[PDB]
Design an enzyme around this catalytic site. Structure first.
Site, mmCIF file in Angstrom:
data_model
loop_
_atom_site.group_PDB
_atom_site.id
_atom_site.type_symbol
_atom_site.label_atom_id
_atom_site.label_comp_id
_atom_site.label_asym_id
_atom_site.label_seq_id
_atom_site.Cartn_x
_atom_site.Cartn_y
_atom_site.Cartn_z
ATOM 1 N N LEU A 124 -5.653 -1.858 -5.139
ATOM 2 C CA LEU A 124 -5.409 -2.984 -4.259
ATOM 3 C C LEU A 124 -6.224 -4.149 -4.794
ATOM 4 O O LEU A 124 -7.381 -3.959 -5.176
ATOM 5 C CB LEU A 124 -5.827 -2.628 -2.834
ATOM 6 C CG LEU A 124 -5.047 -1.495 -2.170
ATOM 7 C CD1 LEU A 124 -5.752 -1.072 -0.904
ATOM 8 C CD2 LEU A 124 -3.637 -1.955 -1.864
ATOM 9 N N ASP A 125 -5.609 -5.347 -4.809
ATOM 10 C CA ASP A 125 -6.265 -6.537 -5.340
ATOM 11 C C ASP A 125 -7.382 -6.966 -4.389
ATOM 12 O O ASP A 125 -7.299 -6.668 -3.203
ATOM 13 C CB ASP A 125 -5.270 -7.653 -5.596
ATOM 14 C CG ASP A 125 -4.167 -7.288 -6.582
ATOM 15 O OD1 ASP A 125 -4.503 -6.702 -7.633
ATOM 16 O OD2 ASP A 125 -2.981 -7.566 -6.285
ATOM 17 N N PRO A 126 -8.453 -7.648 -4.869
ATOM 18 C CA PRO A 126 -9.649 -7.906 -4.060
ATOM 19 C C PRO A 126 -9.423 -8.382 -2.623
ATOM 20 O O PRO A 126 -10.119 -7.924 -1.732
ATOM 21 C CB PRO A 126 -10.413 -8.956 -4.878
ATOM 22 C CG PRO A 126 -9.586 -9.244 -6.125
ATOM 23 C CD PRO A 126 -8.632 -8.109 -6.261
#
EC number: 5.4.99.-
Lengths: 97, 130, 353, 64, 97
Positions: free
Chosen positions: C82-84
């Site tokens: 999952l992206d930040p």
RNA sequence: GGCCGCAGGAAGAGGAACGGAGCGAGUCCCCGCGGGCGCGAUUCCCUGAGCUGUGGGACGUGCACCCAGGACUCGCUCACACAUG
């Protein structure tokens, strides 16, 4: 990889020092790229175009053969084929109007 | 109107202030904001409870998720600071002269509203504890 | 009281065990394993995973780093990045559960996101039609990384749905079910091109990672820290046993093959799963299919590839039922009980004699 | 942030932009609380989650 | 320079933020190269292929226009053409047998 | 159904450890990851119309992140297991 189609480049003449000299017979007298892959009609790469020489409208080319190929294999007037995108038109080498 | 906000309360929002006590606390906050004697964020309130600055800590009872501020009740009980819940975070922000909500405010004592502060403080400490 | 429970209420891989096909009912039980839920807390964590609700600031590799500080373990994996700024379901496998990461990473995901459109559209129905257009197998350019231009690739979107639209802010909630490795940021750009107004992904949350979802068994990072603290300071396991779940919960979809206690250790050493050791076998085992091999106490021994179908198992009397893909269980959990059987004894006897 | 939700009658999350659900209750933020690894308030969260019967250990145990 | 010939790439749909979205209509459902020059049938370069998106057999592409071009110029169902060498076959993106 | 031609066979149906696992390394695949976390002092500043107090920023400062998997290839370890009526 293997190209979608291949166009007639030229026909086999005599071998010369473990590469093969070939008379160029392209439609519209088109000229191949330097180090352009040369194929047989089965789309198997036999080598690459090394030299291009002779008169503009009657020119020859040598083929630096592949790792597995030998110059003794080819017969007289055997045809070779090239990917049509690494041909160029003759007009490019003819002088500017 | 008050009873509608009572639907939105947390599991942990006790002791909840009475309807009149809620009104007293807002008026005390307005005076403290004018005097420049409040702390607003969890970030802020947490910092000055650690330093040991006294004050009435008012919490918003509709704050979710509870993880953002549910450590603060026990931080007060460690230092015997008086704390109390109120119905909504939007009204708590509105009391401090802000359009955006806030989940906690700590009101410091001061001379200009010392009587109002002591009136609120007295009732907060008198609340029944769960 | 277990006698009163129907087999449908037995936990994890022992659920509905009576509806497996019975090859033989006789074996010699050994006091070796436990039910996966009753593993000693050390072993329970080393064979476990967390259905995490990822927070919105850190990267997914930072989050699993934090988990391996807290629990004090050496290895973790994480079921797809999952992206930040993205939140939601992140299956964090711990230690020996990291053997399952490819199955978790390759599983189908679900997302709930917000697309922000750069100009007004006619209404919510127009956005709903552009989502229907971007269902099925789509072209998507993978983003540039370390100046390495990855080629255009295909990813399937199984379902799409337009949940809400706000004409004021030009915001639209969408729900997407999709293949692993689908870029949802890229989907929102394409959805903007298809409408003609333009667009960007405002926000994203992953609501499903294969078998696990946000509906049940999901926990936040505070629970993970908090559960460990309670174990460290008060010696209470109760909280950790609700945060961490055994890796058998990730394998409940797979077709099962129950083995005798004699066979268990042999398979852990790298023996092929032979037919004389099979107690029970599920309906719908196919050739070259990934199956889970379990004990009679419901512990996962290995992920195996089936070389016999269900029907073939029923007809034969010996031979290779399955080959190992990846061994889950440790060596010497059960004792060595191989070479003791009738035909294997006869072989060793007749070599000696 | 922008995503909110409210629970339907069978416990599923119903996502929405609006701050109030169709029954007038406030919607929760979809995203969990921000986490710090240097958080030292574990004692404090357990203390009052026990008090109000909302610690995870006190809830109905899940069916597996 | 200008290519020897050009093959039908696709047709104009709506513009989108100063580049043009186009439905792809290639023979054999071929897919263009990224940053492949897009030409009109007069062999004049209008732009380059920026995005490729949609379903495998019904896909679209955006064209990042040239310095001198404007997105308002193009009419509905206007055709665009590409150098046939920077097309690729659909089989490449379909899964391995 | 029948006739002709070509091609594959001229078949008695075998084998109760076959030829495995777990680590480590090299190379590919996977691979949007300077950002993330904390504390300090002029309440450190800020309800900005700028995201933002359930957090945003400045200056000190420290801290922890940038894997884990799979495939191929060449090692080390453990076995070479038909599962005891």
């Amino acid at each position: 990889g293997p190209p979608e189609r291949v166009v007639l480049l030229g026909e086999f003449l005599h071998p010369c020092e473990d590469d093969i000299v070939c008379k160029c017979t392209t439609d519209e007298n088109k000229v191949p790229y330097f180090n352009a892959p040369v194929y047989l009609e089965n789309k198997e790469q036999i080598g690459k175009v090394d030299e291009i020489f002779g008169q503009l409208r009657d020119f020859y080319f040598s083929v630096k053969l592949s790792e597995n190929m030998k110059a003794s294999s080819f017969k007289k007037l055997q045809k070779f084929y090239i990917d049509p995108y690494k041909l160029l038109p003759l007009q490019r080498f003819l002088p500017r109007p | 109107t008050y009873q509608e906000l009572l639907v939105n309360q947390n599991p942990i929002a006790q002791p909840l202030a009475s309807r009149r006590l809620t009104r007293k606390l807002y008026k005390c906050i307005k005076k403290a904001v004018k005097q420049k004697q409040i702390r607003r964020g969890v970030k802020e309130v947490q910092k000055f409870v650690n330093k040991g600055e006294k004050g009435i800590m008012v919490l918003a009872g509709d704050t979710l998720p509870i993880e953002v501020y549910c450590h603060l009740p026990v931080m007060c009980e460690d230092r015997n600071l008086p704390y109390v819940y109120i119905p909504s975070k939007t009204d708590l922000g509105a009391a401090a002269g802000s359009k955006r909500p806030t989940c906690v405010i700590m009101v410091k004592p001061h001379e200009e509203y010392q009587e109002a502060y002591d009136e609120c403080l007295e009732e907060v400490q008198s609340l029944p504890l769960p | 009281k277990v006698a009163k429970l129907d087999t449908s209420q037995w936990p994890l891989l022992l659920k509905n065990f009576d509806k497996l096909n019975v090859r033989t009912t006789h074996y010699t039980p050994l006091a070796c394993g436990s039910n996966p839920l009753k593993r000693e807390i050390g072993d329970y964590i080393r064979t476990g995973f967390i259905n995490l609700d990822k927070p919105s600031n850190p990267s997914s590799h930072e989050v699993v780093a934090w988990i391996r500080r807290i629990l004090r373990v050496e290895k973790t994996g994480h079921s797809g990045t999952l992206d930040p700024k993205v939140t939601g379901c992140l299956i964090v496998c711990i230690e020996r559960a990291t053997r399952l990461v490819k199955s978790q990473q390759s599983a189908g995901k679900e997302y709930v996101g917000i697309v922000r459109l750069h100009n007004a559209i006619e209404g919510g129905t127009q956005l709903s039609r552009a989502l229907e257009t971007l269902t099925g197998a789509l072209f998507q350019r993978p983003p540039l990384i370390a100046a390495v231009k990855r080629q255009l690739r295909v990813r399937t979107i199984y379902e799409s749905k337009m949940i809400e639209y706000d004409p004021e802010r030009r915001l639209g909630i969408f729900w997407v079910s999709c293949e692993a490795g689908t870029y949802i940021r890229t989907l929102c750009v394409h959805l903007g091109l298809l409408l003609g107004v333009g667009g960007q992904m405002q926000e994203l949350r992953r609501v499903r990672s294969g078998v696990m979802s946000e509906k049940d068994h999901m926990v936040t990072m505070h629970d993970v820290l908090d559960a460990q603290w309670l174990y460290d300071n008060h010696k209470d396991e109760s909280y950790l046993r609700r945060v961490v779940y055994p890796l058998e919960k990730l394998l409940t979809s797979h077709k099962r093959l129950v083995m005798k206690d004699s066979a268990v250790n042999a398979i852990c050493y790298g023996a092929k799963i032979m037919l004389p050791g099979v107690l029970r076998y599920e309906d719908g085992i196919e050739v070259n299919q990934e199956i889970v091999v379990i004990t009679t106490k419901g512990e996962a021994i290995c992920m195996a590839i089936a070389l016999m179908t269900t029907a073939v198992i029923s007809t034969c009397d010996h031979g290779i039922v399955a080959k190992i893909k990846r061994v889950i269980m440790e060596r010497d959990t059960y004792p060595r009980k191989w070479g003791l059987g009738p035909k294997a004894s006869q072989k060793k006897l007749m070599i000696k004699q | 942030m922008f995503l909110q939700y409210y629970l339907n009658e069978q416990g599923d999350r119903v996502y929405t932009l609006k701050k109030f659900d169709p029954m007038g209750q406030q919607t929760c933020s979809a995203h969990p609380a921000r986490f710090s690894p240097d958080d030292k308030y574990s004692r404090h969260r357990i203390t009052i989650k026990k008090r109000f019967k909302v610690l995870m250990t006190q809830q109905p145990r899940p069916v597996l």
